[PDB]
Amino acid sequence: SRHSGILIPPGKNWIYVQRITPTKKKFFVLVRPVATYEIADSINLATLFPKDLFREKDNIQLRVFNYILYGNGKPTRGISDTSIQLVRTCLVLNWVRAFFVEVNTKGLIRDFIRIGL
Amino acid sequence: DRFFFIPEEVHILPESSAIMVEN
Amino acid sequence: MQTPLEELYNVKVERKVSQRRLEELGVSRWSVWKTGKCKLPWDWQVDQLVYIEEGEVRVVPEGSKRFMQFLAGDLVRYPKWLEADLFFNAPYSERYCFKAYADD
């Protein structure tokens, strides 16, 4: 059709079909796959806590927020030798003071971050 | 549940720049 | 003051309990609670019978500067509405049972 761009869903990657018209009587079609990224609603953070057998009700509650770093249709500019991050997965504290905890035994040091309410 | 990223290379250049690629 | 904490706070204690009394109470079927060196604050919402099997505990009622000491072999009844801090300094083991009104 006359539409400048048609996006074809996969019947592995989505295909964006765009009509390009160099002159008033000549035109051609450029076919481009895009990225087909799925953000996992499962971010691996069993790395945080040992998943105790019992969990008491807490006023505090952690949250996992998915963050698309760039706006819809906005350009992502790539600086040489640096990779572009598109998605950030931050943890939001919601319900608080933070301070260090140090465990020492026979000249050995191990730092910790204690975040409490 | 799905986001897309088309790759395009864009160069913004001054009007006086010498372009060695044809349209 | 002059009055002991046990008298003031109505903490019944039966130090050196005979085995007959333990079997009359059915202590062998009571649940088990144990701890190491730690500090436990608690407000009793019902009476609790505790038979200490190992170790010792020092009980500091809320706002108090003195303590009550209970050792292995003692049977303690903590009264309802008691607010206290329990202190342990070594391995401790007990058998407990919570008592509602009447009951025991």
Binding site: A98, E102 | - | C38, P61
Partner: protein
Amino acid sequence: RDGDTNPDEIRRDCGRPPEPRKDPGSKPEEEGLLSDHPYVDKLWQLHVAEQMILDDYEANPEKYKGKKLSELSDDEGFDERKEIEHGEAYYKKTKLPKVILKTSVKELDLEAALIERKYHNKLMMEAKARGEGYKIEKLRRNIEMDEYDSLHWRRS
């Protein structure tokens, strides 16, 4: 009198009412149960002390020559009464207070930890040789923390 420092003790010596308080407005029978055993915080400290002692054993085994790990002793100056030291630390420009938790070597069970440490190293090596990764889900001390929590939960 001089020895009367606790108002709650004084009123029990006579027949006087308790010091009144604002009603919490919440029914105690409707609150969630408590399962965090107070001793678990101490078990966690011992768990960290064993793990970092095990790591040094791996990295610098030349230091641990001719001494059984169960025969280790604390350093000269170990005060059992100063297990908690409060202080402050600077992170970049921010200054967060820092607490130091002194731990003894004689309150740790390094004989059982080493066998557990060596057992998991072997499985990690076997996984590596197969082109696979290995993850440890929990250790003996983590299991020890859950059983203390279960006893506290049952009491509640």
